[PDB]
Design an enzyme around this catalytic site. Structure first.
Site, PDB file in Angstrom:
ATOM      1  N   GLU A 169       0.941  10.963   1.438  1.00 14.06           N
ATOM      2  CA  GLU A 169       1.642  12.234   1.320  1.00 14.06           C
ATOM      3  C   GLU A 169       0.827  13.321   2.001  1.00 14.06           C
ATOM      4  OE1 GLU A 169       2.143  12.618  -2.945  1.00 14.06           O
ATOM      5  OE2 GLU A 169       2.722  10.502  -2.948  1.00 14.06           O
TER       6      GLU A 169
ATOM      7  N   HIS B  69      -0.857   6.040  -2.835  1.00 14.44           N
ATOM      8  CA  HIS B  69      -0.743   4.825  -3.635  1.00 14.44           C
ATOM      9  C   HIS B  69      -0.766   3.579  -2.759  1.00 14.44           C
ATOM     10  CE1 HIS B  69       0.144   7.927  -6.341  1.00 14.44           C
ATOM     11  NE2 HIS B  69       1.454   7.799  -6.450  1.00 14.44           N
TER      12      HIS B  69
ATOM     13  N   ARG C  28       5.725   3.362 -16.543  1.00 15.11           N
ATOM     14  CA  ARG C  28       5.267   3.956 -15.293  1.00 15.11           C
ATOM     15  C   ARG C  28       4.234   5.050 -15.536  1.00 15.11           C
TER      16      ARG C  28
ATOM     17  N   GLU D 195       0.187  -1.897  -7.821  1.00 15.01           N
ATOM     18  CA  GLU D 195       0.062  -0.578  -7.214  1.00 15.01           C
ATOM     19  C   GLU D 195      -1.053   0.198  -7.902  1.00 15.01           C
ATOM     20  OE1 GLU D 195       3.016   2.495  -8.067  1.00 15.01           O
ATOM     21  OE2 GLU D 195       3.141   2.894  -5.913  1.00 15.01           O
TER      22      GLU D 195
ATOM     23  N   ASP E  59     -23.690   7.092  21.542  1.00 13.66           N
ATOM     24  CA  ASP E  59     -24.687   7.537  20.573  1.00 13.66           C
ATOM     25  C   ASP E  59     -24.283   7.030  19.195  1.00 13.66           C
ATOM     26  OD1 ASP E  59     -26.702   8.725  19.188  1.00 13.66           O
ATOM     27  OD2 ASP E  59     -26.184  10.787  19.717  1.00 13.66           O
TER      28      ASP E  59
ATOM     29  N   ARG F 243      -2.601   3.917  -8.145  1.00 17.04           N
ATOM     30  CA  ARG F 243      -2.117   5.268  -7.902  1.00 17.04           C
ATOM     31  C   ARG F 243      -3.219   6.317  -7.866  1.00 17.04           C
ATOM     32  NH1 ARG F 243       2.689   6.779 -10.067  1.00 17.04           N
ATOM     33  NH2 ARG F 243       1.513   8.110 -11.510  1.00 17.04           N
TER      34      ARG F 243
ATOM     35  N   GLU G  28       6.444  12.525   2.202  1.00 18.88           N
ATOM     36  CA  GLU G  28       5.876  11.197   2.040  1.00 18.88           C
ATOM     37  C   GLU G  28       6.570  10.228   2.984  1.00 18.88           C
ATOM     38  OE1 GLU G  28       5.245   9.591  -1.970  1.00 18.88           O
ATOM     39  OE2 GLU G  28       6.223   7.743  -1.304  1.00 18.88           O
TER      40      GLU G  28
ATOM     41  N   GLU H 118       1.412   4.586   0.772  1.00 19.44           N
ATOM     42  CA  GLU H 118       2.421   5.638   0.639  1.00 19.44           C
ATOM     43  C   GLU H 118       1.740   6.998   0.724  1.00 19.44           C
ATOM     44  OE1 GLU H 118       4.140   4.893  -3.171  1.00 19.44           O
ATOM     45  OE2 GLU H 118       4.978   2.948  -2.596  1.00 19.44           O
TER      46      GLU H 118
ATOM     47  N   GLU I 288       8.563  15.208  -1.092  1.00 19.72           N
ATOM     48  CA  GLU I 288       7.879  15.124  -2.370  1.00 19.72           C
ATOM     49  C   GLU I 288       8.246  16.320  -3.247  1.00 19.72           C
ATOM     50  OE1 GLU I 288       6.435  12.261  -2.234  1.00 19.72           O
ATOM     51  OE2 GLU I 288       5.920  12.182  -4.365  1.00 19.72           O
TER      52      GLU I 288
HETATM   53 MG   LIG Z   1       3.366   4.950  -5.651  1.00 18.92          MG
HETATM   54 MG   LIG Z   2       5.056   9.723  -4.067  1.00 19.29          MG
END
Ligand SMILES: [Mg+2]
Ligand SMILES: [Mg+2]
Ligand SMILES: [Mg+2]
Ligand SMILES: [Mg+2]
Lengths: 443, 443
Positions: free
Chosen positions: A133, A244, A315, A332, A52, A334, A195, A131, A188
């Site tokens: 979590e 991330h 960062r 990356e 279906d 986030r 993680e 990554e 974490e």
């Molecule tokens: Mg990260």
């Molecule tokens: Mg982390």
């Protein structure tokens, strides 16, 4: 061609599987499957299985339509937690219309189309390392989740220790036995939050790994009498869950984001990709964060990206460039959360980034001034902008942006907006205990 | 001059009051007072009572400032539920700065200023008749409200019957004994919801009557072991509470909204007032609906006004004109809820309506086509517009509109904006049990 039909038949014969799950993913990201005996393995390989087709449309299904379930041979995986009464195997299946054409509403087919656009543009592959979590909650007497966590750990803490339990260690061991590549796992900062990091493979294989990881984590948490949750913000005052994406672009020569002669050891392709990601971030924030609870995680702070900026030193930006270079050069993002659909997420991301390369956009200058404290005038002076604060604003941004619509396709676009607006309208008209507890006595 | 100092002294002597409540209202609408013995009645009449003036600013008070508490003699009321150990009396008090000037942040002073503007423009009085609705909830063992209602009544039903209890009948009887004018009372369509209608008096007296009615309803309910709630939407799927304002404008000749030679037996002043109300309705929707829960009541239906239109035949518009004419000619605004501050509500309403008269705006043609079913294109073709769907959008509309800012004054405007933004931010970052039940097990 990692596997062939004869190889699949031989595997089914020699590990003696008796149950096969032809699994796929809908627009909402829920893992769905049809379950067949091993005697029907031939019919599945012959691409003659009906199902279906309105199921993948979600709860907004109206008209039933039968459609094929073309499987993928490279995703043959046998689960070990099957006891002795026959093994269980799964195969990721593409959705095809009865006229031998891929369905427009299949997220996997949309991702394949976007990857085809990338390849015809000149690139080879779009590597991703996620990554994710997740949270673990103690079950109640009736096998129902509670609000209590399994342990009061900390960031990178050795909380679950050893001597049985330790659901994260068992999950990692089962994933490694099953044939997945795991980089590292840790605890974490929130209690009961873990993680697990993955290696870098192709985008489609990244989606398959993410979905299998979700399934395996849920199964193992249930078997140990726990509940695994990927909701971004399970509790108030507790850090949210993120997924991330560490993504890199490859060409015939190699990594397209690496250049020793460029600034920050970055190629002009990397800067164009960064500009494309930053320009359309408000556009695809809805796709990367499709739930109402997701935007509760995107609050101003020191770990939640609610600004539009890129950096490699301070960062905690929206987009962070890890210090590693060479073949490991990557960008990356986030702002992604585990509740998002990986297929749609990288579909819209690849489209935005590639549009930035096509247009040769110049990214804004990076900010390393810890953008949490500067005044609103200071933020406005720089090209710093805030992500949408609610699902409705993100849906409006989606409806405004056109490139993200092309990256999502038509059918997926209208279905996503439809389901999301229904979820938003349902949330809006509900009455929450917060309103009662803070107005029932006062008024 | 209904009463004088000597009259107040004689009353205190002859009904033998020993407790006096000098009560006032803050920006948020909470009834506040300072309590003095009868021996200090002289000091109160001499306008020499100090109090912490930052209290009226609400929870956003920063700097303490002492300021006077000039009372009003015409609001002398003695409560009957005082047993034999001395009576209790209340007096509505104006807020004055130490330099013999009314405080800019006092809602009552702002309403008086707006009424002064009206009078100098050419009108005499601004009559109001409110129709508040309240809910009654059964208390728990620990004198805490529950989610169960006292009776399962219906619209205009004879639900509480007789033989004791019947809190509505007792409330009406106490209000009549105390010296208030009550038109009629009945049971609202929701269970446990009751409505009491008032006569038509001046705006300031209307505010005083509304506040005293809230206090009396709360007190009597508590005594009978119940909880009285004015929160607009206590429960989901249950009709909300409204405080429709029936307002009329008077001049030296008489009612300014009545004209036998005009269309619909309405004067051009009435049409200008209607145009002024309709033009700025989106502007003052925040003032008339100051709570988050208020906008949960403003949902599309057959009894909740979420559109901007006026009518006198189909009923259920934003603004309804009752069929009665002559000295009873009036315009009814149905978007007000009991949680609103009456002072600010009619301040902004009078300003908007009077601006419509000054500008001689022509109101849009009335719609009698039951505006719930026509398509969005049909609504867009007509001048039908929707009220703000959330507190944030209403706050944005307030920040955009300038006439409503003038009607509110400065201090009240910034304090209201600050408090409402803080409340909205608190609501936005909270995690509700709805999110958990919708995404915890699913994701
Ligand atoms: Mg990260
Ligand atoms: Mg982390
Ligand atoms: Mg009513
Ligand atoms: Mg009414």
């Amino acid at each position: 061609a990692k596997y062939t039909k004869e190889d699949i038949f031989r595997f089914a014969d020699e590990q003696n599987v008796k149950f096969i799950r032809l699994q796929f993913t809908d627009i909402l990201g829920i893992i769905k499957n049809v379950e067949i005996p091993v005697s029907q393995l031939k019919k599945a390989l012959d691409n003659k299985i009906m199902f279906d087709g309105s199921s993948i449309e979600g709860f907004v299904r109206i008209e039933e339509s039968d459609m094929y379930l073309f499987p993928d041979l490279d995703t043959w995986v046998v689960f070990p937690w099957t006891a002795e009464k026959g093994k269980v195997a799964r195969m990721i299946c593409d959705i095809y219309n009865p006229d031998m054409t891929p369905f427009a509403g299949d997220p996997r087919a949309n991702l394949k189309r976007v990857l085809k656009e990338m390849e015809e543009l000149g690139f080879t592959e779009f590597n991703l390392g996620p990554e994710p979590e997740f949270f673990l909650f103690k079950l109640d007497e009736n096998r129902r989740p509670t609000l209590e966590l399994n342990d009061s750990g900390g960031y990178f803490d050795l909380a679950p220790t050893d001597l049985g339990e330790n659901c994260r260690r068992d999950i990692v061991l089962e994933l490694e036995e099953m044939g997945f590549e795991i980089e590292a796992s840790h605890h974490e900062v929130a209690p009961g939050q873990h993680e697990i990091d993955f290696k870098y493979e192709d985008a489609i294989t990244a989606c398959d790994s993410i979905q299998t990881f979700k399934l395996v984590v849920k199964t193992i948490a249930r078997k140990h009498g726990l509940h695994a949750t990927f909701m971004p913000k399970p509790l108030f005052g507790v850090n949210g869950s993120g997924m991330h994406f560490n993504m890199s672009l490859f060409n015939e020569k190699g990594n397209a984001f690496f250049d020793e002669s460029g600034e920050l050891e970055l190629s002009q392709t990397a800067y164009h990709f960064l500009a494309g990601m930053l320009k359309h971030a408000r556009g695809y924030t809805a796709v990367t964060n499709p739930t109402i609870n997701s935007f509760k995680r995107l609050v101003p702070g020191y770990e939640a990206p609610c600004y539009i900026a890129w950096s490699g030193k301070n960062r905690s930006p929206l987009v962070r460039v890890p210090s590693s270079r060479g073949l490991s050069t990557r960008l990356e993002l986030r702002s992604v959360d585990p509740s998002a659909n990986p297929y749609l997420a990288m579909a819209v991301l690849l489209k935005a980034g590639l549009s930035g390369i096509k247009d040769e956009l110049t990214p804004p200058a990076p900010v390393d001034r810890n953008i949490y404290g500067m005044n609103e005038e200071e933020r406005e002076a720089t090209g710093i902008y805030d992500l949408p604060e609610s699902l409705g604003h993100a849906l409006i941004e989606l409806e405004k942006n056109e490139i993200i619509k092309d990256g999502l396709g038509e059918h997926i676009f209208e279905h996503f907006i439809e389901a999301k607006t229904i979820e938003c309208d349902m949330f809006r008209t509900a009455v929450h205990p917060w309103e009662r507890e803070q107005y029932l006595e006062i008024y």
